[PDB]
Write a protein that binds this ligand. Structure first.
Ligand SMILES: CCCCCCCCCCCCCCCCCC(=O)OC[C@H](COP(=O)([O-])OCC(O)COP(=O)([O-])OC[C@@H](COC(=O)CCCCCCCCCCCCCCCCC)OC(=O)CCCCCCCCCCCCCCCCC)OC(=O)CCCCCCCCCCCCCCCCC
Ligand SMILES: CCCCCCCCCCCCCCCCCC(=O)OC[C@H](COP(=O)([O-])OCC[N+](C)(C)C)OC(=O)CCCCCCCCCCCCCCCCC
Ligand SMILES: CCCCCCCCCCCCCCCCCC(=O)OC[C@H](COP(=O)([O-])OCC[N+](C)(C)C)OC(=O)CCCCCCCCCCCCCCCCC
Ligand SMILES: CCCCCCCCCCCCCCCCCC(=O)OC[C@H](COP(=O)(O)OCCN)OC(=O)CCCCCCCCCCCCCCCCC
Ligand SMILES: CCCCCCCCCCCCCCCCCC(=O)OC[C@H](COP(=O)(O)OCCN)OC(=O)CCCCCCCCCCCCCCCCC
Lengths: 98, 175, 347, 99, 114, 88, 83, 96, 70, 297, 40
């Protein structure tokens, strides 16, 4: 298994850690989400193109059309959270303590 | 040397990933992954992914990366951040690059790094196959089957995206 | 929410769950999960209170993360086996990643953090949907990959779940939080028998699902969210609290109530698999669930609580909602133990 | 699937592309088509757990085709000894090696 | 787990056709119709025997028959062929569309002379 | 080779041209998301030119027309429930 | 009668763009169903060879398949040369 | 007018493709000899380079199968110079 | 009146003319008369590689014909 | 050798873009009872150079609030991506014969939004950010119309290869078959082109884009003929066509008032988009209905 | 109750947490006198 598979594997791993290491900004974490699935996108293309899985070439596109589609919700919950509190800070994401 | 060109594309891909995953300003984090978005297509392009590579630039890069920069241009936290403002992001920045560089050096030393998966650090050009592709581009003929063999995904994707529209307006409706 | 828009929104949520259970291609499974996530956040967003925005947010980030990690469990398995079917998974770390991700969708290990919090902010009826309908699709995948699952992984996860779910339930006073905490506890029973014969998991699923519809829907008719609010219900509805108490012991699982139906067969099965310390801890710590169950029972019907003068107003008027399908949920939740051999039909 | 409706309804929904060696557009063959055909036909109507013991060399052959790890190690060993030898003034490549 | 047996250079040293792509495509149609007897045999062997090492004899025979046809037309109107194929390469995609006139100047010889 | 060269010269010319120019002397958000959601659906619609050359064109006709129908339905839904009407 | 006439008159007076789009889209949705050339479209699309015409073994029982490529047997696409 | 012209291009495509499938038998035969002749040259070097290693029986079968498998393009040129591997791998993808 | 725009546009016209002009001729110069053989698919590429290998001068654009075989 | 062509594709354009400014002013001159620049050299021929030569000599006044990084990077990409736009143009034989040149053309056109967004965000001015906010919303809005229009017309070409476009038109200009889409595309390219210190480069970029987008329409609809033995005939025809389209860009830029923001989106979503959807539906059914689907090869 | 939870207020009875204070963004713009539309 060559380095092209590996390099992007840890690209996701640092992305997976990034989303799991909220600093102060959920927007920054949100931006980490689609980069994380891009690692999924590139791995999907790399394996499929390498093995000439002809019918499976559709799958990487439709991977985008849902991860990007849910990314609309990722902004949409964010775009609404920033209204009541006034910012995207996850520090205020504790009003539901109880 | 363009012997290891795909290595160069692969490594700068992740340093761009470490950039935004270090959690800088969202707008600066955005540009930190568009370069990673830019290089990722190069890896696919060098593998023969013309359409898939151009998809990253068109729907991924030129699409939803714009509205996230748009969203940050809406939010505009009382001070837009930067790599310089936070000192923790610099510590994570150097940590990620150094960790990648050492593992790369270990990978190019003995080619038998067993982290998670055992793997070979051999040349990227090696894994390629032989045999002509005829007159049909396998990357294009495969995705064209979405309307011939992808008779199910169009239904679910079309339904889901329409379902994407209703959920977006309904929750942004604000009661 | 426009009722027609609400109606179709649930229609897709079930459809996404249905897609998971009726497909063999791994990619189609991820669509079923993503589509379900795609159209349940608005269900939580029906009331639009800042508390709901809090809970609806918390759910998405965990569930979106789980789908992404699940998605590599697809590609890594593809990367190391060149397959797309749901079969005996062909890579160790890929199976570990999927199990680590599917569990987060349910919540057994500290992944359980979102389950109580999400339930609190969102409405009661939307809570019902979250605790009973979603928890089918992640279990649907597990029943098909159970043959390849690392046995020594969920068992720790299930033991952790039943322990933490029962442990925290003692300190909760908000009925939604107790309900979610108990769900985490019962979900530990779900996953513990999973590596073994999965027919008992389905029996536990069906028994628990019908058992929590009764618990929730009585709570809805009470229109109560706190223990004191449920305590006052003895005055207006003395019988409703009585059926609440009957569900409570079946909630706990004392025979002959059919809440002991799942636990009994789990012990019986897992004893056939030379596992005898494992059942003992489950039965032991399951008593912790019964503790706060009695506490809620003591406040509800077993004793009486100081009502309020304005409650005399509610005496004159009658409830309007027709508590659909509820009268048989309670019956199918308590006195079902004598008809036990029906589990053969499940497999 | 949990409740496999495809078998009862007799309609294909995902089986068309679930493997790389099924019917493909314009009969484009997958890279490891021959090995998948052998492995799949090795284990049909045999059992989910009998395949992991009986059809092993078929699966190992197919899994080697898709990664080619052992070949990659093989070629690495060839190249490692190649530049370990030529650097010491040993065997020199013939004219067709360099062109 | 075995030895990869492959043929030796003795059977591999076969006469090779030395022409450019435009030469092949210009006379491809006439070559395909006539020089077909070994082509079908070699092609059938490749799909059936599925072993590239097995069809070496057919592989050398089709080239030999192609050599026969190529020198056979050299006995004949090579100049009309020469002008035809030297105009085919001028096109980037090598289309016969811009060379129909020169094509007619080529086929009419082999039409009756062969 | 050729491609990497082409994306190299222009950026270098741009950089020198700024070197001689530097050293010598809700509703608005909502409409954007709707663009993204339509943007994703045009991605499914892009492979059409190769899709038109499949053998089973009848199935392709139904789905290609189907996707554009959902383009219309999504737009029509957003239009009739305000939506595409930008809040002024 | 009067209902559809007034409504269509109303639509074209206020929203000519909308009715034009619906008319074109509504038109395009039905021509393929009764199209007299779609049957040709599949025929020519199936008549374009991208892959090699793999020969089949000759043992008799198949006189339908020709021997030479110029032999009379086999499918003929004179329609393709004409339309 | 466009529909008439498009039909002609489809006819022109047919004529183009009919030229190709006539060229395939010779091309397949030529590339058939070249690929395994290059493979034999690889193993001729293999004997020389692996003379001293413990138990390298030159010509190992990678797979347990006896049927021929198309070689990976990696260990096909291999020993070849830098430019040969460059033109072979990213030749079509980069030529323009 | 307006005939003075023509000197304004003519410079751009000639300036816009050079790129297409320059590409047209140096392709002939580099590829010796024939255009650079376009390779939109694998077939045209390996057609070119066969031409380059058979040329002997390691140049695809050099074409050898009936004179090359005896 | 290849390096010469790359320069030969950039330098004359930059000279042409330089002389576009004189054209922009002066073709609007006699169209204004004006004369246009005539004092700076003969007929203002030195005005292109003069403006392009005095702007660089001015100091680059950047506000301290502006981040020097983004304030420089955003203009840099605004030209570089707009300079590779010219490359895959099928001027007789294009520079890079990309099999997917249409995607390459449109996708790089999708990154021109970043030059405006960052150069407006980095300015940190209330007027600047709303202007950048306005521009980014408008350009991405017309992006969906840009791609759908292309999909419809290109369907009759055969594939996204820009080199195939000349063969498709040949006898008949493709504007004849998609004139309802032609004006749809011409308005769309006007909106994207933002046309109804480190600045001369930006103006050059936004003016090179005008010529190319006009050239992209010229190769798309207003076709021509190409003789393999005399490509120069195609050169003159092509440059003349795109010159006229650039003149039209100037013609309407001095013939209309501005579009209000609400109407700017009202025209697209509620008028342009649904009509574009129907035309795309028309342009996919028709080739199937008439068995006139173009070959992919 | 413990020292950590000695201040956790019970949830609002209607589940509607107290709405945040004035968060309006009524921006003030100066359209001139440099703006050409301001007419000098
Ligand atoms: C196993 C054995 C046991 C289980 C057996 C199977 C039955 C399971 C369900 C039991 C009853 C649950 C129930 O209703 O509890 C009360 C509880 C509260 O009822 P409520 O107080 O009336 O409030 C409900 C809405 O908030 C009210 O909102 P509204 O005021 O807008 O009214 C909308 C309402 C009223 O209906 C309408 O408005 C009708 C709309 C008609 C127009 C649309 C036409 C096209 C679609 C037609 C579909 C038919 O319709 C809906 O809510 C739509 C979803 C349900 C109907 C459609 C389902 C898909 C088909 O129900 C819900 O919250 C509904 C949740 C979704 C369905 C049940 C999911 C839980 C069970 C999952 C596991 C099932 C077993 C799996 C194995
Ligand atoms: C709704 C409109 C779209 C679906 C119906 C029309 C298209 C049917 C179709 O593609 O069937 C494919 C097949 C039948 O295939 P078919 O026989 O029409 O075409 C086969 C084409 N090849 C050989 C290339 C694969 O049916 C299905 O996949 C069922 C899809 C789900 C239908 C119900 C959805 C709810
Ligand atoms: C069998 C046949 C099948 C196909 C038949 C198709 C139907 C017949 C043709 C349909 C109409 C033509 C296509 C649509 C065009 C109009 C779209 C539209 O929205 O119009 C109304 C729109 C808006 O009109 P409005 O403002 O009156 O409002 C219309 C209705 N609402 C309110 C809903 C929008 O018109 C415009 O947008 C006008 C142009 C504005 C931009 C300013 C620049 C104009 C420059 C014009 C001169 C240059 C032209 C260059 C042409 C190309 C040259 C290469
Ligand atoms: C497994 C072990 C047991 C588990 C369950 C234990 C349940 C009780 C445990 C204690 C509960 C808490 C303490 C008591 C709470 C009382 C709740 C309550 O609401 O009490 C008051 C209420 C008032 O009565 P009311 O609702 O007016 O109805 C009267 C009957 N019409 O009272 C009622 O509503 C009482 C309703 C009584 C209904 C009686 C129905 C009788 C039907 C007889 C059918 C006979 C058929 C015979 C056929 C013969 C031939 C085959
Ligand atoms: C041939 C046979 C058919 C002939 C035509 C019959 C149908 C005529 C339809 C006429 C227009 C629709 C009805 C109508 O009058 O709608 C008006 C209204 C205008 O809305 P608006 O501009 O916002 O103004 C009001 C608010 N200020 O409209 C609206 O509010 C809703 C607008 C919805 C637009 C949807 C566009 C979808 C894409 C175009 C259609 C594509 C094809 C779809 C399938 C058609 C199948 C027949």
């Amino acid at each position: 298994m060559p380095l092209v598979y590996m390099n992007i594997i840890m690209a996701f791993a640092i992305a997976l850690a990034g989303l799991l290491m909220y600093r102060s900004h959920l927007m920054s974490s949100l931006l980490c989400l689609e980069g994380m699935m891009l690692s999924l996108f590139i791995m999907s293309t790399l394996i499929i193109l390498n093995t000439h899985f002809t019918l499976a070439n559709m799958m990487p596109i439709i991977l985008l059309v849902f991860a990007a589609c849910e990314a609309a919700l990722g902004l949409s919950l964010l775009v609404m959270v920033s209204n009541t509190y006034g910012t995207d800070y996850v520090q205020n994401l504790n009003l539901l303590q109880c | 040397m363009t012997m290891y060109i795909a290595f160069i594309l692969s490594t700068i891909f992740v340093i761009g990933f470490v950039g935004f995953s270090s959690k800088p300003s969202p707008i600066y984090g955005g540009l930190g992954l568009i370069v990673s978005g830019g290089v990722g297509c190069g890896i696919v392009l060098n593998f023969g992914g013309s359409f898939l590579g151009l998809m990253v630039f068109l729907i991924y890069l030129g699409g939803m990366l714009v509205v996230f920069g748009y969203t940050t241009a809406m939010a505009t936290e009382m001070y837009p951040e930067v790599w310089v403002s936070n000192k923790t992001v610099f510590g994570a920045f150097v940590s990620g690059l150094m960790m990648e560089f050492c593992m790369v050096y270990y990978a190019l030393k003995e080619e038998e790094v067993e982290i998670i998966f055992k793997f070979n650090g051999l040349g990227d050009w090696v894994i390629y196959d032989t045999g002509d592709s005829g007159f049909f581009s396998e990357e294009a003929m495969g995705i064209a089957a979405l309307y011939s063999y992808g008779t199910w995904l169009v239904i679910v994707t079309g339904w889901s995206l329409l379902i994407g529209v209703v959920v977006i307006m309904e929750i942004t409706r604000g009661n | 929410m426009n009722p027609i828009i609400y109606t179709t929104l649930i229609m897709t949520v079930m459809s996404g769950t249905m897609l998971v259970m009726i497909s063999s291609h791994w990619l189609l499974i991820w669509i079923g999960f993503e589509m379900n996530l795609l159209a349940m956040i608005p269900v939580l967003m029906k009331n639009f209170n800042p508390r709901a925005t809090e809970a609806a947010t918390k759910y998405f980030l965990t569930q979106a993360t789980a789908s992404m990690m699940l998605m590599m469990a697809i590609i890594i398995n593809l990367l190391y086996s060149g397959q797309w079917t749901i079969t005996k998974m062909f890579n160790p770390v890929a199976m570990t990643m999927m199990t680590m991700a599917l569990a987060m969708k349910l919540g057994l290990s500290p992944f359980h953090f979102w389950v109580p919090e999400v339930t609190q902010g969102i409405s009661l009826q939307a809570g019902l949907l979250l605790l009973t309908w979603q928890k089918l699709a992640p279990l649907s995948v597990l029943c098909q990959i159970s043959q390849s699952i690392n046995p020594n992984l969920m068992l720790t996860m299930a033991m952790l779940s039943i322990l933490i779910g029962g442990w925290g339930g003692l300190n909760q006073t908000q009925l939604r939080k107790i309900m979610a905490y108990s769900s985490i506890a019962h979900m530990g029973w779900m996953t513990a028998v999973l590596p073994y014969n999965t027919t008992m998991t389905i029996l536990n699923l069906l028994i628990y699902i019908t058992m929590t519809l009764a618990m929730f829907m009585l709570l809805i008719h009470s229109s109560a969210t706190t223990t004191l609010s449920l305590s006052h219900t003895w005055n207006k509805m003395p019988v409703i609290t009585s059926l609440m108490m009957v569900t409570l012991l079946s909630m706990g699982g004392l025979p002959p109530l059919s809440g002991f139906m799942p636990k009994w067969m789990i012990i019986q099965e897992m004893t056939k698999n030379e596992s005898i310390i494992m059942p003992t801890l489950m039965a032991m710590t399951a008593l912790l669930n019964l503790y706060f169950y009695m506490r809620l029972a003591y406040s509800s019907s077993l004793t009486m609580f100081p009502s309020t003068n304005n409650m005399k107003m509610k005496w004159q008027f009658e409830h309007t909602k027709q508590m659909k399908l509820l009268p048989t949920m309670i019956v199918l939740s308590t006195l079902v133990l004598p008809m036990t051999p029906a589990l053969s039909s499940l497999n | 699937p949990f409740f496999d409706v495809q078998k009862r309804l007799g309609l294909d929904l995902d089986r068309w592309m679930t493997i790389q060696s099924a019917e493909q557009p314009h009969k484009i063959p997958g890279r490891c088509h021959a090995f998948e055909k052998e492995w799949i036909e090795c284990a049909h109507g045999i059992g989910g757990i009998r395949a992991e013991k009986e059809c092993k060399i078929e699966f190992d052959d197919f899994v080697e085709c898709l990664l080619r790890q052992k070949t990659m190690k093989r070629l690495s060993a060839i190249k490692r000894q190649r530049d370990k030898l030529i650097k010491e003034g040993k065997y020199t490549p013939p004219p067709h090696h360099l062109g | 787990p075995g030895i990869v047996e492959l043929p030796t250079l003795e059977d591999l040293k076969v006469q090779e056709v030395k022409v450019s792509s435009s030469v092949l495509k210009a006379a491809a149609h006439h070559y395909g119709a006539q020089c077909d007897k070994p082509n079908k045999e070699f092609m059938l062997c490749r799909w059936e025997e599925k072993d590239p090492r097995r069809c070496l004899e057919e592989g050398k025979l089709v080239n030999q028959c192609a050599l026969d046809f190529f020198r056979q037309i050299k006995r004949h109107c090579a100049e009309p062929f020469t002008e035809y194929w030297t105009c085919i390469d001028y096109s980037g995609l090598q289309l016969f569309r811009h060379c129909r006139k020169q094509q007619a100047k080529f086929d009419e010889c082999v039409l009756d002379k062969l | 080779m050729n491609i990497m060269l082409t994306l190299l010269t222009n950026v270098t010319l741009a950089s020198l041209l700024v070197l001689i120019a530097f050293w010598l002397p809700m509703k608005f958000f909502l409409v954007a998301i709707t663009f993204l959601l339509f943007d994703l659906e045009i991605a499914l619609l892009l492979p059409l030119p190769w899709a038109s050359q499949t053998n089973n064109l009848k199935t392709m006709l139904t789905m290609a027309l189907f996707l554009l129908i959902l383009l219309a339905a999504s737009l029509a839904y957003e239009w009739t429930q305000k939506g595409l009407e930008w809040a002024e | 009668a009067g209902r559809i006439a007034s409504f269509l008159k109303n639509a074209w007076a206020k929203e000519p763009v909308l009715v034009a789009s619906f008319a074109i889209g509504g038109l395009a949705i039905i021509l393929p169903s009764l199209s007299p050339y779609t049957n040709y479209a599949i025929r020519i699309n199936r008549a374009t060879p991208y892959n090699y015409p793999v020969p089949l073994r000759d043992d008799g029982n198949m006189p339908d398949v020709p021997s030479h490529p110029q032999d009379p047997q086999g499918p003929s696409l004179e329609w393709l040369k004409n339309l | 007018s466009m529909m008439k012209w498009n039909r002609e291009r489809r006819r022109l495509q047919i004529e183009d493709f009919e030229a190709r499938i006539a060229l395939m038998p010779l091309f397949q035969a030529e590339k058939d000899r070249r690929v395994l002749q290059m493979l034999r040259e690889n193993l001729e070097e293999e004997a020389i380079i692996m003379k001293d290693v413990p138990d390298w029986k030159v010509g190992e079968s990678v797979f347990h199968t006896t049927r021929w498998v198309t070689p990976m393009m990696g260990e096909l040129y291999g020993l070849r110079t830098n430019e040969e591997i460059l033109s072979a791998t990213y030749g079509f993808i980069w030529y323009t | 009146m307006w005939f003075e725009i023509l000197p304004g546009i003519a410079v751009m016209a000639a300036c816009l003319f050079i790129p297409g002009m320059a590409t047209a001729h140096i392709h002939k110069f580099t590829n010796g008369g024939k255009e650079k053989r376009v390779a939109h698919f694998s077939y045209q590429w390996n057609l070119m590689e066969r031409d380059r290998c058979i040329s002997g001068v390691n140049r695809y654009h050099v074409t050898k014909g009936l004179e090359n075989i005896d | 050798m290849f390096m010469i062509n790359i320069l030969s594709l950039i330098i004359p354009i930059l000279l042409a873009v330089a002389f576009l400014t004189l054209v922009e002013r002066k073709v609007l001159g006699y169209m204004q009872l004006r004369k246009g620049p005539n004092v700076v050299g003969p007929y203002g021929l030195l005005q292109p150079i003069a403006d392009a030569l005095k702007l660089v000599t001015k100091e680059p006044l950047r506000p301290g609030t502006s981040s020097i990084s983004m304030f420089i990077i955003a203009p840099i990409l605004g030209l570089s991506l707009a300079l590779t736009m010219w490359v895959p143009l099928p001027m007789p034989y294009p520079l890079i014969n990309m099999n997917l040149g249409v995607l390459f053309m449109l996708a790089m056109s999708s990154l021109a939004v970043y030059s405006i967004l960052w150069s407006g965000w980095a300015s940190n001015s209330k007027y600047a950010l709303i202007g950048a906010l306005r521009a980014v919303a408008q350009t991405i809005s017309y992006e969906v119309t840009l791609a759908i229009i292309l999909l419809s017309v290109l369907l009759m070409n055969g594939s996204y290869t820009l080199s195939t476009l000349i063969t498709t038109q040949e006898h008949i200009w493709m504007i004849f078959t998609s004139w309802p889409l032609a004006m749809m595309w011409f308005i769309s390219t006007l909106a994207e082109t933002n046309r109804a210190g480190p600045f001369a480069m930006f103006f050059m970029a936004e003016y090179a884009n005008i010529i190319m987008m006009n050239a992209f329409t010229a190769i798309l609809f207003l076709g021509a003929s190409h003789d393999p033995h005399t490509p120069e005939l195609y050169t003159i025809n092509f440059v003349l066509k795109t010159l006229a389209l650039t003149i039209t860009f100037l013609w309407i830029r001095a013939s209309y008032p501005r579009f209000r923001y609400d109407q700017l989106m009202h025209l697209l979503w509620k008028s342009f988009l649904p009509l574009t959807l129907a035309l795309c539906m028309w342009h996919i059914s028709l080739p199937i209905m008439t068995a006139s689907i173009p070959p992919q090869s | 109750p413990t020292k950590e939870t000695a201040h956790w207020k019970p949830p609002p009875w209607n589940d509607v947490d107290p709405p945040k204070d004035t968060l309006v963004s009524n921006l003030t713009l100066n359209f001139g006198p440099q703006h050409p539309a301001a007419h000098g």
